[PDB]
């Protein structure tokens, strides 16, 4: 199917406690593969997935070079933002950045990204055309004019259509056995009376990859959208994901309920019934 690469970065200023903390992480699909932490002893980009260890130290030298450069830029961006918003040096502020690309199943470029948030809200983002910028406020308009005049977009487009796509295809091949794997959900049901006349049916999906999944409860084929308690999909910590969905039913009308599980790793959707 399609695939994606994303580098995430956060800078958090800490006025009295020295210079801003910088943390970057890289992902292929739902799999982390690199990290860099400015407060870490190493001062290097480190591997976090088996398939990236085989890169030679020139990759690593260049990657920690690029990521160290990024932390300095974002440190200066935090200061420029203090001016633009006329904020005091007393406060802690956050600058986040994401960039990366999507490719189709043939490995062709679909989409590029390059965007920033300041204090948790959109600042400036490159549009899907990879030529224009979306400025979220007056402060960002200034940056936009600055980057428009400097033709920043063209450089990013070159990175995103070129280097970023090649990297993705490479990682997807080198790490074919884990990245192009599909682990279907291991499913089961639990069941607990909550009174003389009602019971909870809970439908579980465990050990699946990638994270995308849909759990749905029906009563006699009717979707129970508004009456389904659902948790956010969560990492099990071994690279796979978990989710459950529950409904409150009258006892013993349990047989009227069906839980439906859809996931890319299943030949056909599963139906579970107590």
């Amino acid at each position: 199917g399609s695939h994606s690469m994303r580098y995430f970065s956060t800078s958090v200023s800490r006025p009295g406690r020295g210079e801003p903390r910088f943390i970057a992480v890289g992902y292929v699909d739902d799999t982390q593969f690199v990290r860099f932490d400015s407060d870490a002893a190493s001062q290097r980009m480190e591997p976090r997935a088996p398939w990236i260890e085989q890169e030679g130290p020139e990759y690593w030298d260049e990657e920690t070079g690029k990521v160290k450069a990024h932390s300095q830029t974002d440190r200066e961006n935090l200061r420029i933002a203090l001016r633009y918003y006329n904020q005091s040096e007393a406060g802690s502020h956050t600058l986040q950045m994401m960039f990366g690309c999507d490719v189709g199943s043939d490995g062709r470029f679909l989409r590029g990204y390059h965007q920033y948030a300041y204090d948790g809200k959109d600042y400036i983002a490159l549009k899907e055309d990879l030529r224009s910028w979306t400025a979220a406020d007056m402060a960002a308009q200034i940056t936009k004019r600055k980057w428009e005049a400097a033709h920043v977009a063209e450089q990013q487009r070159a990175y995103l259509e070129g280097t970023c796509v090649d990297g993705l295809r490479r990682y997807l091949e080198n790490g074919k056995e884990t990245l192009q794997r599909t682990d279907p959900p291991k499913t089961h049901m639990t069941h607990h009376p909550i009174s003389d006349h009602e019971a909870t049916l809970r439908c579980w999906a465990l050990g699946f990859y990638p994270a995308e999944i849909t759990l749905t409860w029906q009563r006699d084929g009717e979707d129970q959208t508004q009456d389904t308690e659902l948790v956010e999909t969560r990492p099990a910590g071994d690279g796979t994901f978990q989710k459950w969905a529950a409904v409150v039913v009258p006892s013993g009308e349990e047989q009227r309920y069906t839980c439906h599980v859809q996931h890319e790793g299943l030949p056909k959707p599963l139906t579970l019934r107590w």
């Binding site: 990024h70 830029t73 200066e76 961006n77 420029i80 933002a81 200034i142 940056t143 600055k146």
Partner: peptide, 6 residues
């Protein structure tokens, strides 16, 4: 593979 101010 990894990748002017405000």
């Amino acid at each position: 593979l990894y990748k002017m101010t405000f």
